[PDB]
Each structure stands twice: as structure tokens, then as C-alpha cells.
PDB file of C-alpha atoms and ligand atoms in Angstrom:
ATOM      1  CA  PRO A   1     -10.947 178.314  22.250  1.00  0.00           C
ATOM      2  CA  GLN A   2      -7.378 180.150  21.897  1.00  0.00           C
ATOM      3  CA  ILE A   3      -5.954 180.997  18.547  1.00  0.00           C
ATOM      4  CA  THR A   4      -2.314 181.767  18.019  1.00  0.00           C
ATOM      5  CA  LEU A   5      -1.076 184.037  15.162  1.00  0.00           C
ATOM      6  CA  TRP A   6       1.671 182.130  13.567  1.00  0.00           C
ATOM      7  CA  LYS A   7      -0.751 181.691  10.614  1.00  0.00           C
ATOM      8  CA  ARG A   8      -3.752 183.846   9.525  1.00  0.00           C
ATOM      9  CA  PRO A   9      -6.523 183.402  11.879  1.00  0.00           C
ATOM     10  CA  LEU A  10      -9.030 181.637   9.398  1.00  0.00           C
ATOM     11  CA  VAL A  11     -12.388 180.068  10.631  1.00  0.00           C
ATOM     12  CA  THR A  12     -15.439 178.804   9.068  1.00  0.00           C
ATOM     13  CA  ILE A  13     -18.652 180.660   9.254  1.00  0.00           C
ATOM     14  CA  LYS A  14     -22.257 180.312   8.335  1.00  0.00           C
ATOM     15  CA  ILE A  15     -24.028 183.056   6.575  1.00  0.00           C
ATOM     16  CA  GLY A  16     -27.326 183.046   4.604  1.00  0.00           C
ATOM     17  CA  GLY A  17     -27.156 179.202   4.571  1.00  0.00           C
ATOM     18  CA  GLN A  18     -23.674 179.343   3.168  1.00  0.00           C
ATOM     19  CA  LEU A  19     -20.439 178.148   4.771  1.00  0.00           C
ATOM     20  CA  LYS A  20     -17.257 180.279   4.076  1.00  0.00           C
ATOM     21  CA  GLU A  21     -13.764 180.825   5.379  1.00  0.00           C
ATOM     22  CA  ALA A  22     -13.097 184.355   7.054  1.00  0.00           C
ATOM     23  CA  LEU A  23     -10.361 186.114   9.147  1.00  0.00           C
ATOM     24  CA  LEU A  24     -11.062 186.936  12.706  1.00  0.00           C
ATOM     25  CA  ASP A  25      -9.765 190.457  12.267  1.00  0.00           C
ATOM     26  CA  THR A  26      -9.347 192.911  15.322  1.00  0.00           C
ATOM     27  CA  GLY A  27      -8.188 195.649  12.755  1.00  0.00           C
ATOM     28  CA  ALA A  28     -11.503 195.530  10.923  1.00  0.00           C
ATOM     29  CA  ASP A  29     -14.150 197.860  12.283  1.00  0.00           C
ATOM     30  CA  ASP A  30     -16.881 195.970  10.261  1.00  0.00           C
ATOM     31  CA  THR A  31     -17.279 192.519   8.862  1.00  0.00           C
ATOM     32  CA  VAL A  32     -16.670 192.382   5.018  1.00  0.00           C
ATOM     33  CA  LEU A  33     -17.432 189.349   2.943  1.00  0.00           C
ATOM     34  CA  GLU A  34     -16.711 188.231  -0.657  1.00  0.00           C
ATOM     35  CA  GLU A  35     -19.424 189.141  -3.252  1.00  0.00           C
ATOM     36  CA  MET A  36     -22.336 186.905  -2.351  1.00  0.00           C
ATOM     37  CA  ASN A  37     -25.983 187.296  -3.540  1.00  0.00           C
ATOM     38  CA  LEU A  38     -27.667 188.151  -0.459  1.00  0.00           C
ATOM     39  CA  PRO A  39     -31.537 188.797  -0.353  1.00  0.00           C
ATOM     40  CA  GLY A  40     -33.079 192.108   1.001  1.00  0.00           C
ATOM     41  CA  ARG A  41     -32.254 195.681   0.946  1.00  0.00           C
ATOM     42  CA  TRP A  42     -28.861 197.375   1.476  1.00  0.00           C
ATOM     43  CA  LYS A  43     -27.141 200.772   1.551  1.00  0.00           C
ATOM     44  CA  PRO A  44     -23.998 201.732  -0.370  1.00  0.00           C
ATOM     45  CA  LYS A  45     -20.768 202.267   1.501  1.00  0.00           C
ATOM     46  CA  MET A  46     -17.053 202.751   0.857  1.00  0.00           C
ATOM     47  CA  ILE A  47     -14.285 201.372   3.178  1.00  0.00           C
ATOM     48  CA  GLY A  48     -10.802 202.221   3.175  1.00  0.00           C
ATOM     49  CA  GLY A  49      -7.534 200.526   3.997  1.00  0.00           C
ATOM     50  CA  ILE A  50      -4.043 199.979   2.570  1.00  0.00           C
ATOM     51  CA  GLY A  51      -4.301 200.821  -1.085  1.00  0.00           C
ATOM     52  CA  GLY A  52      -7.491 202.911  -0.811  1.00  0.00           C
ATOM     53  CA  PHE A  53     -11.276 202.305  -0.838  1.00  0.00           C
ATOM     54  CA  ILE A  54     -13.582 199.506  -2.229  1.00  0.00           C
ATOM     55  CA  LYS A  55     -17.296 199.824  -2.785  1.00  0.00           C
ATOM     56  CA  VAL A  56     -19.635 197.512  -0.598  1.00  0.00           C
ATOM     57  CA  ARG A  57     -23.080 196.731  -0.078  1.00  0.00           C
ATOM     58  CA  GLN A  58     -24.218 197.217   3.746  1.00  0.00           C
ATOM     59  CA  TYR A  59     -26.513 194.702   4.884  1.00  0.00           C
ATOM     60  CA  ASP A  60     -28.013 195.013   8.596  1.00  0.00           C
ATOM     61  CA  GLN A  61     -29.090 192.631  11.073  1.00  0.00           C
ATOM     62  CA  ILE A  62     -27.460 189.639   9.277  1.00  0.00           C
ATOM     63  CA  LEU A  63     -27.269 186.147  11.087  1.00  0.00           C
ATOM     64  CA  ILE A  64     -23.596 184.871  11.156  1.00  0.00           C
ATOM     65  CA  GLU A  65     -22.308 181.813  13.023  1.00  0.00           C
ATOM     66  CA  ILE A  66     -18.651 181.623  13.776  1.00  0.00           C
ATOM     67  CA  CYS A  67     -17.409 178.403  15.246  1.00  0.00           C
ATOM     68  CA  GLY A  68     -20.748 177.674  16.676  1.00  0.00           C
ATOM     69  CA  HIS A  69     -21.043 181.092  18.140  1.00  0.00           C
ATOM     70  CA  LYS A  70     -24.115 183.012  16.720  1.00  0.00           C
ATOM     71  CA  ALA A  71     -24.004 186.543  16.034  1.00  0.00           C
ATOM     72  CA  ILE A  72     -26.251 189.294  14.232  1.00  0.00           C
ATOM     73  CA  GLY A  73     -25.070 192.374  12.821  1.00  0.00           C
ATOM     74  CA  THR A  74     -23.712 194.551   9.763  1.00  0.00           C
ATOM     75  CA  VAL A  75     -22.133 192.638   7.041  1.00  0.00           C
ATOM     76  CA  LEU A  76     -20.541 194.457   4.015  1.00  0.00           C
ATOM     77  CA  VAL A  77     -20.488 192.574   0.832  1.00  0.00           C
ATOM     78  CA  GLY A  78     -18.135 193.601  -1.986  1.00  0.00           C
ATOM     79  CA  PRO A  79     -14.827 192.870  -3.970  1.00  0.00           C
ATOM     80  CA  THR A  80     -12.924 192.309  -1.132  1.00  0.00           C
ATOM     81  CA  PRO A  81      -9.603 190.146  -1.510  1.00  0.00           C
ATOM     82  CA  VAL A  82     -10.544 188.360   1.779  1.00  0.00           C
ATOM     83  CA  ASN A  83     -13.366 187.520   4.098  1.00  0.00           C
ATOM     84  CA  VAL A  84     -12.971 189.229   7.560  1.00  0.00           C
ATOM     85  CA  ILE A  85     -14.939 189.094  10.625  1.00  0.00           C
ATOM     86  CA  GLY A  86     -14.608 192.414  12.216  1.00  0.00           C
ATOM     87  CA  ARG A  87     -15.168 194.016  15.706  1.00  0.00           C
ATOM     88  CA  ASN A  88     -18.783 194.605  15.178  1.00  0.00           C
ATOM     89  CA  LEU A  89     -19.392 190.667  15.307  1.00  0.00           C
ATOM     90  CA  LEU A  90     -16.127 189.661  17.335  1.00  0.00           C
ATOM     91  CA  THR A  91     -17.649 191.417  20.398  1.00  0.00           C
ATOM     92  CA  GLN A  92     -20.628 189.478  20.187  1.00  0.00           C
ATOM     93  CA  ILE A  93     -18.839 185.985  20.245  1.00  0.00           C
ATOM     94  CA  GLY A  94     -16.735 187.262  23.310  1.00  0.00           C
ATOM     95  CA  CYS A  95     -13.517 187.392  21.450  1.00  0.00           C
ATOM     96  CA  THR A  96     -10.475 189.323  23.161  1.00  0.00           C
ATOM     97  CA  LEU A  97      -6.851 189.916  22.551  1.00  0.00           C
ATOM     98  CA  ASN A  98      -4.675 188.525  25.337  1.00  0.00           C
ATOM     99  CA  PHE A  99      -0.925 188.984  25.906  1.00  0.00           C
TER     100      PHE A  99
ATOM    101  CA  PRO B   1      -3.666 192.300  29.390  1.00  0.00           C
ATOM    102  CA  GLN B   2      -6.952 191.146  28.057  1.00  0.00           C
ATOM    103  CA  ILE B   3      -8.526 193.688  25.394  1.00  0.00           C
ATOM    104  CA  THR B   4     -12.123 193.664  24.353  1.00  0.00           C
ATOM    105  CA  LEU B   5     -13.254 194.954  21.120  1.00  0.00           C
ATOM    106  CA  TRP B   6     -15.850 197.341  21.647  1.00  0.00           C
ATOM    107  CA  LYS B   7     -13.482 200.029  20.398  1.00  0.00           C
ATOM    108  CA  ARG B   8     -10.382 199.772  18.371  1.00  0.00           C
ATOM    109  CA  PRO B   9      -7.629 197.954  20.062  1.00  0.00           C
ATOM    110  CA  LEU B  10      -5.158 201.011  20.022  1.00  0.00           C
ATOM    111  CA  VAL B  11      -1.856 200.777  22.325  1.00  0.00           C
ATOM    112  CA  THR B  12       0.982 202.833  22.706  1.00  0.00           C
ATOM    113  CA  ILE B  13       4.180 201.694  20.927  1.00  0.00           C
ATOM    114  CA  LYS B  14       7.743 202.991  21.402  1.00  0.00           C
ATOM    115  CA  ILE B  15      10.039 202.863  18.173  1.00  0.00           C
ATOM    116  CA  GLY B  16      13.177 204.732  17.248  1.00  0.00           C
ATOM    117  CA  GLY B  17      12.854 206.502  20.686  1.00  0.00           C
ATOM    118  CA  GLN B  18       9.420 207.755  19.725  1.00  0.00           C
ATOM    119  CA  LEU B  19       5.894 207.026  21.228  1.00  0.00           C
ATOM    120  CA  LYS B  20       3.151 206.360  18.987  1.00  0.00           C
ATOM    121  CA  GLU B  21      -0.257 204.848  18.903  1.00  0.00           C
ATOM    122  CA  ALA B  22      -0.947 201.797  16.844  1.00  0.00           C
ATOM    123  CA  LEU B  23      -3.681 199.233  16.088  1.00  0.00           C
ATOM    124  CA  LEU B  24      -3.385 195.556  17.019  1.00  0.00           C
ATOM    125  CA  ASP B  25      -4.412 194.091  13.875  1.00  0.00           C
ATOM    126  CA  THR B  26      -4.782 190.380  13.562  1.00  0.00           C
ATOM    127  CA  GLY B  27      -5.718 190.673   9.891  1.00  0.00           C
ATOM    128  CA  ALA B  28      -2.458 192.248   8.988  1.00  0.00           C
ATOM    129  CA  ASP B  29       0.486 189.645   8.272  1.00  0.00           C
ATOM    130  CA  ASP B  30       2.952 192.490   8.536  1.00  0.00           C
ATOM    131  CA  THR B  31       3.419 195.759  10.631  1.00  0.00           C
ATOM    132  CA  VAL B  32       2.904 199.009   8.683  1.00  0.00           C
ATOM    133  CA  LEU B  33       3.493 202.339  10.085  1.00  0.00           C
ATOM    134  CA  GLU B  34       2.715 205.839   8.866  1.00  0.00           C
ATOM    135  CA  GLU B  35       5.614 207.901   7.313  1.00  0.00           C
ATOM    136  CA  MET B  36       8.480 208.473   9.658  1.00  0.00           C
ATOM    137  CA  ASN B  37      12.100 208.795   9.993  1.00  0.00           C
ATOM    138  CA  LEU B  38      13.775 205.453  11.335  1.00  0.00           C
ATOM    139  CA  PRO B  39      17.374 204.946  11.669  1.00  0.00           C
ATOM    140  CA  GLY B  40      18.531 201.855   9.853  1.00  0.00           C
ATOM    141  CA  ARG B  41      18.988 200.418   6.335  1.00  0.00           C
ATOM    142  CA  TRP B  42      15.682 200.089   4.426  1.00  0.00           C
ATOM    143  CA  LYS B  43      14.582 198.376   1.125  1.00  0.00           C
ATOM    144  CA  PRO B  44      11.759 199.377  -0.932  1.00  0.00           C
ATOM    145  CA  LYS B  45       8.847 196.933  -1.082  1.00  0.00           C
ATOM    146  CA  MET B  46       5.310 196.563  -2.192  1.00  0.00           C
ATOM    147  CA  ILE B  47       2.413 195.433   0.130  1.00  0.00           C
ATOM    148  CA  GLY B  48      -1.216 194.965  -0.784  1.00  0.00           C
ATOM    149  CA  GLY B  49      -4.441 195.805   1.281  1.00  0.00           C
ATOM    150  CA  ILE B  50      -8.144 195.785   0.770  1.00  0.00           C
ATOM    151  CA  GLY B  51      -7.810 198.775  -1.773  1.00  0.00           C
ATOM    152  CA  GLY B  52      -4.612 197.694  -3.754  1.00  0.00           C
ATOM    153  CA  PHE B  53      -0.882 197.996  -3.259  1.00  0.00           C
ATOM    154  CA  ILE B  54       1.134 200.747  -1.616  1.00  0.00           C
ATOM    155  CA  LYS B  55       5.001 201.550  -1.781  1.00  0.00           C
ATOM    156  CA  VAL B  56       6.661 200.772   1.730  1.00  0.00           C
ATOM    157  CA  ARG B  57      10.236 201.007   3.017  1.00  0.00           C
ATOM    158  CA  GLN B  58      11.047 197.824   4.774  1.00  0.00           C
ATOM    159  CA  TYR B  59      13.140 198.072   7.864  1.00  0.00           C
ATOM    160  CA  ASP B  60      14.525 194.675   9.428  1.00  0.00           C
ATOM    161  CA  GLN B  61      15.343 193.687  12.924  1.00  0.00           C
ATOM    162  CA  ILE B  62      13.969 197.018  14.400  1.00  0.00           C
ATOM    163  CA  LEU B  63      13.522 197.205  18.194  1.00  0.00           C
ATOM    164  CA  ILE B  64       9.869 198.032  18.946  1.00  0.00           C
ATOM    165  CA  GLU B  65       8.037 197.944  22.254  1.00  0.00           C
ATOM    166  CA  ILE B  66       4.094 197.367  22.204  1.00  0.00           C
ATOM    167  CA  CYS B  67       2.186 197.855  25.338  1.00  0.00           C
ATOM    168  CA  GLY B  68       5.234 197.196  27.361  1.00  0.00           C
ATOM    169  CA  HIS B  69       6.364 194.093  25.535  1.00  0.00           C
ATOM    170  CA  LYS B  70       9.437 194.228  23.405  1.00  0.00           C
ATOM    171  CA  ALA B  71       9.648 192.910  19.928  1.00  0.00           C
ATOM    172  CA  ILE B  72      12.399 193.053  17.211  1.00  0.00           C
ATOM    173  CA  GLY B  73      11.314 192.508  13.626  1.00  0.00           C
ATOM    174  CA  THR B  74      10.356 193.841  10.468  1.00  0.00           C
ATOM    175  CA  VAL B  75       8.738 197.142  10.231  1.00  0.00           C
ATOM    176  CA  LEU B  76       7.020 198.516   6.979  1.00  0.00           C
ATOM    177  CA  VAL B  77       6.898 202.185   6.586  1.00  0.00           C
ATOM    178  CA  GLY B  78       4.480 203.793   4.156  1.00  0.00           C
ATOM    179  CA  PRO B  79       1.293 205.369   3.330  1.00  0.00           C
ATOM    180  CA  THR B  80      -1.019 203.436   5.569  1.00  0.00           C
ATOM    181  CA  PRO B  81      -4.242 204.857   6.769  1.00  0.00           C
ATOM    182  CA  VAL B  82      -3.326 203.975  10.502  1.00  0.00           C
ATOM    183  CA  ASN B  83      -0.399 202.347  12.344  1.00  0.00           C
ATOM    184  CA  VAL B  84      -0.998 198.794  12.438  1.00  0.00           C
ATOM    185  CA  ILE B  85       0.696 196.116  14.562  1.00  0.00           C
ATOM    186  CA  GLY B  86       0.510 192.791  12.398  1.00  0.00           C
ATOM    187  CA  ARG B  87       1.184 189.182  13.268  1.00  0.00           C
ATOM    188  CA  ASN B  88       4.793 189.161  12.715  1.00  0.00           C
ATOM    189  CA  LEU B  89       4.997 191.358  15.953  1.00  0.00           C
ATOM    190  CA  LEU B  90       1.890 189.958  17.740  1.00  0.00           C
ATOM    191  CA  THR B  91       3.404 186.591  17.800  1.00  0.00           C
ATOM    192  CA  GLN B  92       6.338 187.900  19.531  1.00  0.00           C
ATOM    193  CA  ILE B  93       4.651 189.322  22.299  1.00  0.00           C
ATOM    194  CA  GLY B  94       2.659 186.310  22.867  1.00  0.00           C
ATOM    195  CA  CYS B  95      -0.671 187.777  21.659  1.00  0.00           C
ATOM    196  CA  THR B  96      -3.562 185.049  21.098  1.00  0.00           C
ATOM    197  CA  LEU B  97      -7.244 185.514  20.235  1.00  0.00           C
ATOM    198  CA  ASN B  98      -9.589 184.146  22.844  1.00  0.00           C
ATOM    199  CA  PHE B  99     -13.289 183.560  22.596  1.00  0.00           C
TER     200      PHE B  99
HETATM  201  C1  LIG C 101      -7.484 200.849   8.769  1.00  0.00           C
HETATM  202  C2  LIG C 101      -7.022 199.494   9.475  1.00  0.00           C
HETATM  203  C3  LIG C 101      -6.994 198.328   8.546  1.00  0.00           C
HETATM  204  C4  LIG C 101      -5.995 198.550   7.253  1.00  0.00           C
HETATM  205  C5  LIG C 101      -4.528 198.893   7.755  1.00  0.00           C
HETATM  206  C6  LIG C 101      -8.216 198.029   8.070  1.00  0.00           C
HETATM  207  N1  LIG C 101      -8.328 196.665   7.328  1.00  0.00           N
HETATM  208  C7  LIG C 101      -8.300 195.355   8.067  1.00  0.00           C
HETATM  209  C8  LIG C 101      -6.856 194.732   8.147  1.00  0.00           C
HETATM  210  O1  LIG C 101      -6.793 193.721   9.019  1.00  0.00           O
HETATM  211  C9  LIG C 101      -6.511 194.305   6.689  1.00  0.00           C
HETATM  212  C10 LIG C 101      -7.323 193.037   6.374  1.00  0.00           C
HETATM  213  C11 LIG C 101      -6.908 192.309   4.958  1.00  0.00           C
HETATM  214  C12 LIG C 101      -5.996 191.243   4.772  1.00  0.00           C
HETATM  215  C13 LIG C 101      -5.666 190.687   3.579  1.00  0.00           C
HETATM  216  C14 LIG C 101      -5.795 191.374   2.265  1.00  0.00           C
HETATM  217  C15 LIG C 101      -6.681 192.799   2.355  1.00  0.00           C
HETATM  218  C16 LIG C 101      -7.170 193.203   3.633  1.00  0.00           C
HETATM  219  N2  LIG C 101      -5.098 193.810   6.827  1.00  0.00           N
HETATM  220  C17 LIG C 101      -3.909 194.600   5.990  1.00  0.00           C
HETATM  221  O2  LIG C 101      -4.353 195.456   5.347  1.00  0.00           O
HETATM  222  O3  LIG C 101      -2.836 193.934   6.099  1.00  0.00           O
HETATM  223  C18 LIG C 101      -1.638 194.559   5.267  1.00  0.00           C
HETATM  224  C19 LIG C 101      -0.587 194.638   6.025  1.00  0.00           C
HETATM  225  O4  LIG C 101      -0.163 193.079   6.206  1.00  0.00           O
HETATM  226  C20 LIG C 101      -0.400 192.504   5.110  1.00  0.00           C
HETATM  227  O5  LIG C 101      -1.198 190.989   5.439  1.00  0.00           O
HETATM  228  C21 LIG C 101      -2.507 191.481   5.139  1.00  0.00           C
HETATM  229  C22 LIG C 101      -2.483 192.389   3.922  1.00  0.00           C
HETATM  230  C23 LIG C 101      -1.275 193.384   4.265  1.00  0.00           C
HETATM  231  S1  LIG C 101      -9.236 196.575   5.837  1.00  0.00           S
HETATM  232  O6  LIG C 101      -9.133 195.337   5.322  1.00  0.00           O
HETATM  233  O7  LIG C 101      -8.592 197.436   4.988  1.00  0.00           O
HETATM  234  C24 LIG C 101     -11.031 196.879   6.332  1.00  0.00           C
HETATM  235  C25 LIG C 101     -11.509 198.305   6.620  1.00  0.00           C
HETATM  236  C26 LIG C 101     -12.904 198.678   7.034  1.00  0.00           C
HETATM  237  C27 LIG C 101     -13.772 197.343   7.337  1.00  0.00           C
HETATM  238  N3  LIG C 101     -15.108 197.699   7.822  1.00  0.00           N
HETATM  239  C28 LIG C 101     -13.168 195.998   7.353  1.00  0.00           C
HETATM  240  C29 LIG C 101     -11.876 195.854   6.719  1.00  0.00           C
END
């Protein structure tokens, strides 16, 4: 589809058998999702933006479905104010910027 | 143009007669640029990111050309990790997300 940017580009995603809302975020290198009790191992990481850094848990090879488009890659989990789909997964669903 | 997301969507902008590089950031409501001198009245404001809130100077009705497309809108100046073009200007240049 085509998403205009009058409002935040929020979409429904499916991850670990859960449905959530997340932003399609071209400014996010990597996907970051709200605290959720995901199974399996992980590696600590710190990610920075406006305001500074937050600590997150990096899970690898996680399966995510974004508007029926399946993807698999890195998902960071932590106390983020918002769920964002980053470029690591946006590339996998064919998402482009167009003007 | 159509921009893929395998790398950061960085483009050249012109503001206040100066060229700069900025990130097209669909997860930013607002446009925030690193510290710089801008002619025009400004008002102090607070804006919040993933790591908290920073102090910015709000300039209104600023002319800014993004990748050859002109926009006139609000520009926040302050300690952002990188120059970001947010939705307030992305809408003006006709930018949509497509997949
Ligand atoms: C380094 C480039 C940007 C910050 C400049 C990176 N951010 C994504 C960005 O889209 C962020 C995503 C974001 C959205 C909402 C709340 C926190 C973060 N938006 C943001 O900070 O926008 C601010 C400016 O406009 C306002 O509207 C949103 C907040 C304000 S981020 O959230 O900090 C981020 C950093 C690393 C990863 N892997 C994933 C996300």
C-alpha cells in the first residue's frame, strides 16, 4: 500500500504470537519494541536518540509479520516509549520512501 | 525519487543559505537539526525522544529545500544526535511510504 504522513504511520504487527501496533520508522536503524517477555537468548545493547540512550535486549532471527508481509531479523526489546519498525525489517517488506 | 532503506535515507538540504545532510525520519513528528545559527525569531521548547527530553529553539515558517523540494515550516534546533527531517516537512514534499 501507500501510507501518507499526515499522521503517525502506525500499523499492526504480529510477533511471538502477539499483535501490537508499531511505527514504520525510516529513522530507526533497528526495530525496537515495548517490553515483552520473549523466549530465548539475547545480548545487551544500548541505543541512542533524542534525549540519550536506553538499554534494550537484542533478539536475533525473530519472525515478524507487518501488514501480512513476513520478515525475520533483529528485534530490540526495552522500555521504549513507542514501538518502531526499523530499516532492518522495512527493507524486507519492500518499503521505500517516495516523493 | 524512490529511496530504498538498506542504508540510512540521508539527503542534502538547504536551510539559511547553507547545505547540510539530514535523515528522512518517518518516526519523527517534527524536524530537529543540530546546533546552528538561523536568522529569525525563535522560541524555546521541549521535545522528547527515545531517551527523554531535550531543549530546542523553535523557528517557524523557515524556508528549507530537501533534495530539491521546497518546504516552509517549523524547524527545531538543538542537541539531536543527527539532523532529522520529520513528518511536518515530509508531508510538504509529498513523501509517502510504499510497500
Ligand atoms: C538517530 C535518529 C533517530 C533520533 C533522531 C532515531 N530514532 C528514531 C526516530 O524516528 C524517533 C522515533 C521515536 C518516536 C516517538 C517517541 C520516541 C522515539 N523519532 C524522534 O525522536 O522524533 C522526535 C522528533 O519529532 C518528534 O516525534 C517523535 C518524537 C520527537 S530512535 O527512536 O531514537 C531509535 C534509535 C536506534 C534504533 N535501533 C531504533 C529507534
